[PDB]
Design an enzyme around this catalytic site. Sequence first.
Site, short mmCIF file in Angstrom:
data_model
loop_
_atom_site.label_atom_id
_atom_site.label_comp_id
_atom_site.label_asym_id
_atom_site.label_seq_id
_atom_site.Cartn_x
_atom_site.Cartn_y
_atom_site.Cartn_z
CD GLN A 94 8.71 0.53 -7.74
OE1 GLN A 94 8.91 -0.64 -7.30
NE2 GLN A 94 9.09 1.21 -8.58
CG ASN A 121 -0.38 2.98 -10.39
OD1 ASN A 121 -0.52 2.04 -9.78
ND2 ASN A 121 0.97 3.53 -10.88
CD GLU A 150 -20.94 8.85 8.66
OE1 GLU A 150 -20.60 9.03 9.87
OE2 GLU A 150 -20.97 9.78 7.91
N1 LIG Z 1 -0.83 -1.22 -8.99
C1 LIG Z 1 0.58 -0.93 -9.02
N2 LIG Z 1 1.24 -2.20 -8.56
C2 LIG Z 1 2.45 -2.40 -8.40
C3 LIG Z 1 3.39 -1.68 -8.75
N3 LIG Z 1 4.55 -1.89 -8.52
C4 LIG Z 1 4.58 -2.98 -7.97
N4 LIG Z 1 3.41 -3.39 -7.94
C5 LIG Z 1 3.03 -4.68 -7.39
O1 LIG Z 1 3.60 -4.98 -6.29
C6 LIG Z 1 3.93 -6.39 -6.06
C7 LIG Z 1 5.37 -6.46 -5.54
O2 LIG Z 1 5.35 -6.23 -4.20
P1 LIG Z 1 5.51 -4.94 -3.36
O3 LIG Z 1 4.93 -4.86 -1.85
O4 LIG Z 1 5.53 -3.66 -4.64
O5 LIG Z 1 7.27 -4.78 -3.14
P2 LIG Z 1 7.96 -3.34 -2.62
O6 LIG Z 1 6.84 -2.35 -2.32
O7 LIG Z 1 9.04 -2.76 -3.63
O8 LIG Z 1 8.75 -4.08 -1.27
P3 LIG Z 1 10.08 -4.44 -1.56
O9 LIG Z 1 10.30 -5.45 -2.54
O10 LIG Z 1 10.57 -4.92 -0.09
O11 LIG Z 1 11.10 -3.29 -1.88
C8 LIG Z 1 3.84 -6.85 -7.47
O12 LIG Z 1 3.32 -8.29 -7.63
C9 LIG Z 1 3.17 -5.90 -8.26
O13 LIG Z 1 2.00 -6.74 -8.61
C10 LIG Z 1 2.87 -0.33 -9.32
O14 LIG Z 1 3.67 0.62 -9.79
N5 LIG Z 1 1.52 -0.11 -9.43
MG LIG Z 2 10.68 -1.78 -2.76
#
Ligand SMILES: Nc1nc2c(ncn2[C@@H]2O[C@H](COP(=O)(O)OP(=O)(O)OP(=O)(O)O)[C@@H](O)[C@H]2O)c(=O)[nH]1
Ligand SMILES: [Mg+2]
Lengths: 56, 425, 426, 47, 430, 432
Positions: free
Chosen positions: E11, E219, E245
């Site tokens: 996400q 974002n 590079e």
């Molecule tokens: N910049 C930004 N950061 C995000 C967003 N959504 C979640 N995060 C960050 O991502 C962290 C959560 O870990 P993730 O790697 O995103 O979890 P995931 O991608 O949903 O993977 P799973 O939990 O296994 O489903 C949080 O601490 C947030 O700070 C977003 O929409 N934009």
């Molecule tokens: Mg996820």
Amino acid sequence: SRKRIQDLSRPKKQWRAPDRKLFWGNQDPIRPVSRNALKAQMTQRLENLAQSKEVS
Amino acid sequence: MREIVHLQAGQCGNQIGAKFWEVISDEHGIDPTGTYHGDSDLQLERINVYYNEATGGKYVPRAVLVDLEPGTMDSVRSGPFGQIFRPDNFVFGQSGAGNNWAKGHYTEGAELVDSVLDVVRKEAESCDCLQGFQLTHSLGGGTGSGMGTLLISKIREEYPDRIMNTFSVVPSPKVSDTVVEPYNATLSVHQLVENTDETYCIDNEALYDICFRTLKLTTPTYGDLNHLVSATMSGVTTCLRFPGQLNADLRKLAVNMVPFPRLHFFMPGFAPLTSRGSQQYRALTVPELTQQMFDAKNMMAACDPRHGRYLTVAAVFRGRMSMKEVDEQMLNVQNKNSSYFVEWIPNNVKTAVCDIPPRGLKMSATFIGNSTAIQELFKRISEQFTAMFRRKAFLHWYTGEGMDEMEFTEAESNMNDLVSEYQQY
Amino acid sequence: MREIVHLQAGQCGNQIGAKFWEVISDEHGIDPTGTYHGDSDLQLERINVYYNEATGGKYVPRAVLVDLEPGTMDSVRSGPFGQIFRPDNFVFGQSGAGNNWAKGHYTEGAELVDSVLDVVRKEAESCDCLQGFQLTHSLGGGTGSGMGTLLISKIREEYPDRIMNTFSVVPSPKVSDTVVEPYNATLSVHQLVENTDETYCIDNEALYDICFRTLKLTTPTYGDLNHLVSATMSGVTTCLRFPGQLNADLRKLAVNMVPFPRLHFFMPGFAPLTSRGSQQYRALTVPELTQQMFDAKNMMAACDPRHGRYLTVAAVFRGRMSMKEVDEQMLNVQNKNSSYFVEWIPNNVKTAVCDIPPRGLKMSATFIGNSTAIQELFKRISEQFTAMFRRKAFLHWYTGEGMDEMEFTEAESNMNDLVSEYQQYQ
Amino acid sequence: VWVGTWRPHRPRGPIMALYSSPGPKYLIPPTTGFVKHTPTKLRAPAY
Amino acid sequence: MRECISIHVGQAGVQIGNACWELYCLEHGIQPDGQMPDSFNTFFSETGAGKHVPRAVFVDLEPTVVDEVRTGTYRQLFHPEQLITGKEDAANNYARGHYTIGKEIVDLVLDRIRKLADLCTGLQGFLIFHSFGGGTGSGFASLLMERLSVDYGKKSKLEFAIYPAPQVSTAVVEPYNSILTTHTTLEHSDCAFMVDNEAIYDICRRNLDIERPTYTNLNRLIGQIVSSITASLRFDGALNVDLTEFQTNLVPYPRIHFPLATYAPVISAEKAYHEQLSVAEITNACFEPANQMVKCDPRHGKYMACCMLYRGDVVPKDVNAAIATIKTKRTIQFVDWCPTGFKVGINYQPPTVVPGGDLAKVQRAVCMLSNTTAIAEAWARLDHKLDLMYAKRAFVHWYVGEGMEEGEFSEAREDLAALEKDYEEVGVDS
Amino acid sequence: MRECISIHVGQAGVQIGNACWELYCLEHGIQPDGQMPDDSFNTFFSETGAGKHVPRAVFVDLEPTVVDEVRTGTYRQLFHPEQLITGKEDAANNYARGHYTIGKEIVDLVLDRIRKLADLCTGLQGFLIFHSFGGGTGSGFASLLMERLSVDYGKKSKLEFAIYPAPQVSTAVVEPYNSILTTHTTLEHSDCAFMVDNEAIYDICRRNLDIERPTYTNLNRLIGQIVSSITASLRFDGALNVDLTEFQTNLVPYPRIHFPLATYAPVISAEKAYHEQLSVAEITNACFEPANQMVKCDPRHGKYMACCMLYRGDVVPKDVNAAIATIKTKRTIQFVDWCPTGFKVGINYQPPTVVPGGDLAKVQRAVCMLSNTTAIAEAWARLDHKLDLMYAKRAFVHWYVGEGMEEGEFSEAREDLAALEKDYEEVGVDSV
Ligand SMILES: Nc1nc2c(ncn2[C@@H]2O[C@H](COP(=O)(O)OP(=O)(O)OP(=O)(O)O)[C@@H](O)[C@H]2O)c(=O)[nH]1
Ligand SMILES: [Mg+2]
Ligand SMILES: Nc1nc2c(ncn2[C@@H]2O[C@H](COP(=O)(O)OP(=O)(O)OP(=O)(O)O)[C@@H](O)[C@H]2O)c(=O)[nH]1
Ligand SMILES: Nc1nc2c(ncn2[C@@H]2O[C@H](COP(=O)(O)OP(=O)(O)O)[C@@H](O)[C@H]2O)c(=O)[nH]1
Ligand SMILES: Nc1nc2c(ncn2[C@@H]2O[C@H](COP(=O)(O)OP(=O)(O)O)[C@@H](O)[C@H]2O)c(=O)[nH]1
Ligand SMILES: [Mg+2]
């Protein structure tokens, strides 16, 4: 500490074997003949694969 | 008065000869209707070499249209220049040979030969003197490589002394177009060496490279590819149709080119090849023509000049130039890269200068070369043949229609002897 | 009839040499299309020293435009003089250069070198008589620094007697736009020292100082930098094109300039520089060029000439001047600065007086100097090299692509030898 | 190739344009049954 | 001829790609429908009618984000095959991310990557969007790029990943699984930027006047830097620098390849109608300790290699004076083994603004890329936070129950200690 | 000159023909009711002096339940009333009954119709047998008709487009009995056998195409489309024409090894190729997918020995060999050492037609890839495993010997299929 400097100076490890470099306008093939099907292969006994005639 | 009779068999030979009869009707000014529409005299006083007469000023070409598959007959008949051919030489079979040499030569290809020899004899008996036999076909097809070889065997067994010319395409080294290419390629032209005296090997990947990296065409089609071969086809026999200052016919392109009756394989060419994006940035002079004649980018074969050593070179020039800069440029060719020419022949070039350049351009050239690098092609063909032979890979389609196992071995032996005798010199 | 072949490698080299054709085509009165529309007839007589011919009266220069990325040919073709070149003279690549030695010398560049000698032999064999080769590149990158230095080796062995006119932009002591500049400088001028016959070292810092201080620009653009280099570029070969009371060709500017075959690095220049608002204030006379000629603040290299001596000094005077003056002032400056000229060479200066000055000026000059003070540049390049070599900073990026350890050591050794010969004869 | 005094120059390293995409090599899981289904179909119920 | 391939995993990457693939649509001229009202080739291919194909793949194991993307206004822009869904969530597990559910879907996402790479001629690198915290962006991207390396070889990989912020987090196991994420990075990745979330909050609190910031602003501020990376790739400029590079001039040693990101003129639209910024202070606007996108203090390490890509009306005369006055002061400190230091990039296109957005219409805009020895502390605290959890074997039973082993953890702790030793050794002077 | 005869029999064959003659009428100007509202229609249609065109095929079946809808529906105006041969009783999943007791009798009309269809055509080219391998009318009746045609017409080419039992999807239980027992009869009197199954077409219609819950009409229209390019060059002019009789000397190295695959690449929905450019280099590269095949085999464990590419419509003759050369450079498609050439190309000048309102998308390109591999040898191993497990306790032999013939022909299956299994291994052994 100098051996550690030598340890970081080791560049990397590769994964994809590089693709073959081909040259055009020559009488060489793309996939080389293995030279063991050239003049080292021998036929087998049940190689009766001949032409199937009409019925009789 | 001095005639040449043209023959073609197969899809490749038919669609090359179609572009041939377009380009040489354009040089002589003949519309697809069949009348004369050129605006000169020098293209009308020697027109009987490629054409005949008819009532009302109809100019009928002298060609023989044969194929066991009648599919290409409707394509060449309903093409642009298809209504000049007379409707009696159109002889065709009903069952196509289809990339089998046995169907093209022995059991079906020989049954249509009695019909094509009649038309060839009827054409050859209406001329004052015969000089050439022009054949275009494919070297590893079924009907082109099957009955063309039978036709030239019959012609050479009946006409002993007349020079004959094959303008044939050969299998490419990079991409393959048929799986039985090595079988037909080896086994059909082991009757080319003992029959013919002037053959022209053409590839198709080199023509594509010419159209892409020299002519710079984004969509090079087959209709634009056979014109490239037909240019050299029309340029070889230029001194027969037009006057000039050093006139060489096809017979004098044999003594100066063929030192031994086996070594007679030639790679054609055509010099003034450039894109229209740099046509105005060059000056059409003799030095750039003779520079690009001896370049790998203006040859119809995938054999580089590096791989061997040139034996004889012919170069027919057209247009209005002088001859001493031509001879001096040939001398610098011989003297600069002398490591690619044979030491045991002192002069290695033959030059002929015509007087009528083609339409559009102001000068043109035609390059014909003999070298000991054509044996690299036969080495590859023998390689593929021996790889496909010992597993009996596709001998099922051969041995059931009058073949023998030892005939393939004789063909491979002849090829090995040819490559050995090319290496020896 | 005495021909010079032009080559440009790298986008820095292509930029510095692309504007070079603007000051030549306008000097010979040639349209950007290529046709001739000038007024005089003297500029058309010797036009076959840089150009070629075409039917209908169009003129196409000889050039081998070479690069590794196709991101330059959409720009230099779309520039002011993009239509004048030849499409078959363009040589390109697919993959990036990466500003490294391996992709110009060994891996990518070594593929392209067979196809650049094809067009080199295309042009070099359609000429009447050849003088040498003209090449524009830099000393702090991967394309111009590495691949062009491969190209001088692939040309030099084919033509052992001709002259190699290279044009080097040297990394500056205070400004650097690349982080691997000392590596690409040492690896280049290790092998540059034994093939080319004259190198014109140019620093961006000193040339920027000239642009800010002498002729008073506030905002110097890159085109106004390349124009100032191109003035010197066309000033060297002005005896091949126009008559003069004292002619001195490219070969005469090679014998008289080096006393030893390895000390052939030159400091260029250009005398009559003035501000924008002070062009029509007075007529330029000959005693007010030598003061602009023999000062440290006119020099295109960052090495201060006063930190050494001068071996051979050139002055390609262009215009309609007398000859007693242009020898009396050279005698006067020789007597004025004794400690800046060596003792064992009696006459330290060569003069060459042409006739035609560039358009816009009734008089001009050109300076080429071979001074011992350029050993300061090699010393700081060697120290910046060894700063990144006592700890192997970026050797990871070279040694993984065909490079090996000890050729850097022998290149540093080669630099030390060049420094010791340059100091030894002082 | 060297059949005289001329030879082609040999690059010391691989060309970055050689490193291209491999063709058809991956088996993508079937879309019939239950033993191996893609997580892109709404699966049919077993019973 | 200058292609880049974009993968958006989890996400935290798809939500950034949502902003990126509207920013890129506004930078050129393609209505989200995809049609037109010649330098777009590095992100779009063509159709006969005239639609443009985004060269990006949208993958996650939860169908929610891609499902709401499909129902939005990007249904016509994208192809239904780059929008790859999944059945069941990665469930916040590095083990579950690439071993049971994430093991199989690789064969579909890689087949689509292979179909994307065949339509281009000048492919250079990979633009992977993920995060170091979860399981989809940390486990699936791990093995995915791991076998991308065996799929392509020397073609570089550019991740734009976020970091566990040093005093805020959402997941509890973030330091427990973030260490296991980097076990594939230092052998199958060449440059992965580190842009956490807390420093963007501080930036939009101080440099911006905005209140209650959402994920959208973060974002967009990340996507501005991502678009500024490929500025010289799409447009013309004085000093053209590409990805090839970028691999070399930024990374001294193969393990030391985690640099920072910084966008200097983030000034509010309300304060934009009065002041007009200049080069001599926008260069200092990158090196301030409160203007960066990771919550680490730069005095804690010496700089190694800097890279600034000035965009807009920039003349190269005064960037020289900017670096010259950068060299003179004392708080900005480099290493002794790099006398040259920097890398200059100049383009001719000012940044685009987004309607209903946050950023303003500025003339010059510099994107700063730098690696510093200060990030060793940003790993040291994550190491210590994993050590505190591992001393009682806290969440081990939720990882060994899916296919991992304790024997994998026994090969897992010591490499990051080796990395700390690498940073300490490379930081000293000779 | 260039006429061909195709025989439809069984249920799978007759439904495939029902879908196929839709496409055959759509390519030309022939209405679905026979007339028109030019010599390219002589291969599939004859001409009557009133303008009616009569098809050159036969529809033979032992049940009337599936020929009745043709005899009463949209196409009763097209087909010959005496070519619409109907039986009385079903073969009922029995080789023996439909080969020996009820299938022996009705061929006195089937062969007579074939004879009267052959007396119109002058240059007959070959036979296209349309049946299924796992029924009684498909696998037993067509087999006996193939015996009779082989012993009557001699060396005329014979082609089989037959439905093969899928490894998992199978609607009958006597499939390995009357499927293997057909293979004693096929490979002796055949020249090629383009097998397809039903699971792989389901996967193609589901994933490449996007139709959910597909009836048999989708599968049969795909079959008609892939056999529409097998006779494209017989009726349409092209640059590189490949007629019917040169298929076999390109695809068949050994007379035993004549079991090739089939693949039609540009099969896609209307709202999927609309977001696509469909260049030549990415269509023939999609013919080599494991997910694009019409039979469930893995070509990664197979070894290609022959190939044919039959392009249609606006195909440049230059990008074809440029797409072959990159295939030659890739290592994912490995050939055997005794075939150093590999490929065969045919280019035509007619784009593929699409049914209006159908699931397929309009294009001006079409690629049909025909190739034989050693991966087909696994498709026989599973049926041999099935017969070994089922014949071990004589499961359904009483229904077979009850027609009056012994079980020795079942015992003839093991040596024949063992030879066909081990010689496939032998011809793929490397040079050692
Ligand atoms: N910049 C930004 N950061 C995000 C967003 N959504 C979640 N995060 C960050 O991502 C962290 C959560 O870990 P993730 O790697 O995103 O979890 P995931 O991608 O949903 O993977 P799973 O939990 O296994 O489903 C949080 O601490 C947030 O700070 C977003 O929409 N934009
Ligand atoms: Mg996820
Ligand atoms: N793909 C496809 N397969 C079909 C179709 N019709 C029948 N089949 C196949 O045919 C098989 C049944 O064998 P058939 O030869 O049709 O049996 P039959 O012709 O009724 O002869 P008997 O079994 O003796 O009654 C089934 O397993 C189906 O897979 C069709 O329209 N499309
Ligand atoms: N290069 C080139 N090759 C052609 C052309 N036309 C046909 N061919 C070649 O001709 C061969 C087919 O020969 P074919 O006429 O079918 O032989 P036939 O069956 O005995 O008549 C193929 O291998 C093609 O490579 C053409 O226009 N250019
Ligand atoms: N003086 C000057 N220097 C330039 C110009 N263009 C580029 N450069 C310098 O070239 C250096 C980079 O060299 P580069 O072109 O990247 O090397 P290459 O890519 O291998 O050819 C920078 O340090 C710039 O200072 C110019 O027009 N004038
Ligand atoms: Mg039935």
